[PDB]
């Protein structure tokens, strides 16, 4: 929130924790198709503090605050030789990532209904 107040640029981080072997490959995809590698800069696997044989990487993507404020979905895709289909992805954007308000609308109907 402090970085978002400055209205300069926001940094979104993708943390990959727990893996083993030491190779992992993270890609970033702004709302749809791939971001070009100048933008983000993932680090290198470095042994996790307190879990003997697992590791962790970290990839940081820097975007314009408007771009983050409009509401774009940014996705982190990890390729590892240990995942199900070697790849997985987690997306986050403006309102999913630590939103200030939850706005729901349960509308249950036919509460009776011959079941």
């Amino acid at each position: 929130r402090e970085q978002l107040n400055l209205r300069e640029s926001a940094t979104i981080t993708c943390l990959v924790t727990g893996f083993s072997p030491a190779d992992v490959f993270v890609q970033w995809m702004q709302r749809g198709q791939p971001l070009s590698p100048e933008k983000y800069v993932t680090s290198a696997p470095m042994p996790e503090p307190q879990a003997p044989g697992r590791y962790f990487a970290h990839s940081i993507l820097t975007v314009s605050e408007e771009e983050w404020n409009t509401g774009e979905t940014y996705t982190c895709v990890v390729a590892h030789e240990a995942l199900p289909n070697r790849v997985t992805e987690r997306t986050v954007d403006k309102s999913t990532g630590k939103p200030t308000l939850y706005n729901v609308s349960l509308v249950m109907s036919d509460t009776a209904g011959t079941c």
Partner: peptide, 24 residues
């Protein structure tokens, strides 16, 4: 869910806010 997207199989779809449940 409160954080699931509208299109469960589409990660980039907008967040789902309105949940309708018709018990029939």
């Amino acid at each position: 869910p409160l954080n699931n997207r509208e299109n469960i199989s589409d990660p980039t779809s907008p967040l789902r806010t309105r949940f309708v449940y018709h018990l029939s």
